[model samples]
Target: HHWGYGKHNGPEHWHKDFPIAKGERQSPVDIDTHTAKYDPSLKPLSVSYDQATSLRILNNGHAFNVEFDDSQDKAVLKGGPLDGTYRLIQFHFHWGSLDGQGSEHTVDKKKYAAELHLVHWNTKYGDFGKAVQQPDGLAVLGIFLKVGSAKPGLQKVVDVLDSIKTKGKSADFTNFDPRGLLPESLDYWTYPGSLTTPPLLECVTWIVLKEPISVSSEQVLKFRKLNFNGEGEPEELMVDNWRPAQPLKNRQIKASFK
Candidate 1:
């Protein structure tokens, strides 16, 4: 079983927090991942919500693992200051398997219990994973999940949280629509940065939304209930699912819709 935060050796005592107060790779609060100078070349071609795509839910016992199948090629980026085409290969989130706290990005040293990363790629690249290898191959949309107002969209996933209470388990999710979960406003902040995780490659153009989508306290509890401790089980529980923060490496982050 994973230990909850505030307990002995919990998140408060994480390696990134103390004994090494200054890690160039410290998470939860490194760069404000926003856009100040909107580049016309950075805008998306069109944006669409895939209703035909079904979500595959895996009971990893950490966060609800959601997957879908659709022609990412049709995905669009529209009405942005930039003009470009971005494809949605596969979108996923990073969470602590233990349900305590397992997000890679931090804000101002205040960790928001959990973080969700929706991965997208610039169509200029061929495949999704391949984009990670290039400097401008990826664009990640970040959302912060805090313990408060019950976000309506999260209901789709949280409703099934109980089915996969254990580690290394998953369920089939059909007709899973995620567009409703998005914040009312699409305005966002943009920056040229690296993936919050390793190899900490500086090949990502980050577009972080300023407004956060809210999840209920119960939903927040679900995340804290994940476990990364796999041990000898078929699947490991989420334990230390987070990666150590990376170095700034002399990079500047810009924001849009300022």
Candidate 2:
């Protein structure tokens, strides 16, 4: 059976095909601020990107992805629980069909409207495919999206959703910087976890931001309009593309801010 965000193939049943789905360090864990330990030694995160490296956006059956040219060191993320520089590869989002429940990682059990993942590969591992299997191979910057004012920086992305509405469709999306989607505060919670999707690689150092960026209700509804099925397939709404929070056993969440 094919893996997807559907009732039969969704996150809960992933362990049938991918054994690591129930592994020790799974992602999207619910972060309890009251219990997180304050770590003064963790360095501030450093993110640098070049707009020219952004290549295109595509509807990859599961979610829409904004891919970047990773052939060079054009976009890099370092520090804050990362051992080496990681090259930016692509970014994607997870949301619900409705406004109340979308974000993957929740704070104090509070959910946001959506969540954004900026995926990166550790330079030492050379490429994303190989890096995804190692312990320190990946670094993901997770930002929550709250429903409030419309975010001007995200207008360009939302506008193009109509063009790539179908799965496997892609369009030129250059000169756009992914950094514009980030919240003002860099304070975050750090932990080791697996990819929230299938293959479920336990190779990520997750940096989940404490602050959430604003997005209008209208803008979020646009995301729900994208198709999760292929061109000729039965239509499936592309919402709630997030994995449920996993168990946090034998792990400590470190807070970057007091």
Candidate 3:
């Protein structure tokens, strides 16, 4: 069976085949900051990205991804609730048709225009496929995107969008430094969560930054042009490619700052 953000096959109906879609520790939960605990012990984040490893970008139907060469520990993330160094395998975005709603995780029910997920897998757990099955396997650097001034770093990625407009399309995207896209403040809230998409595995450690980076309305419009359909199939724009907030459920969100 196929799954997408459409009315029939989106998040609402994913549980039919991938039962874990309704499981505990699911991601993109509403971050009720008021009740969240302020953990003093939460270590500051350690993030390092290597621009040379930047590879090609692919349209996976669900979202566009710029995959990296995770053969060794070059572009890696550690600390800030991570057990070991996690390799940056790929990065992607989730967005909505309009600017008001697109972000997966919300700040007290406040949705942003979009959300960027820097997907990483723990090196100790072996390959990305194997890591996803382990409890402490993955760590995602979550950064919300609000519409405002244009982001030069974001433009680099957007400039290449025309090359891969349909599903299953890809183009060589190189020399991208994910670091340039980060917010000035590294402050964040973290928790044990799962993959927001189907087969929704409960294995990710989410580190969501409190400060959102800015993107232009035009930039998001470029992303909206991409499709969930292939060249021969009926065209379908890839908007609202985000899962709504799930229940916090038996979990505690810890803030790095008080």
Candidates in order, TM-scores: namely 0.71, 0.98, 0.98
Q: Candidate 3, after superposition: displacement of residue 257 in Å?
A: 1.0
Candidate 2 residue-wise lDDT at 251: 88
Cα lDDT of model 3 by residue, 32-97, tens digit? 999888998987799888533889999999999998888988799988988879999999999999
> How accurate locally, in lDDT, is each candidate?
0.56, 0.91, 0.92
Stretches > 4 Å off in candidate 2:
none
Q: Candidate 1 on 57-108: residue-level lDDT in tens? A: 7754434557655356544443353335665544555655433465566554
lDDT of 2 at 209: 93
Q: Which pairs clash inside model 3?
A: none
Candidate 2 lDDT score at position 66: 94
**Residues 27-57 of candidate 2: C-alpha lDDT, one tens digit per residue:** 8899999999999999989988753388899
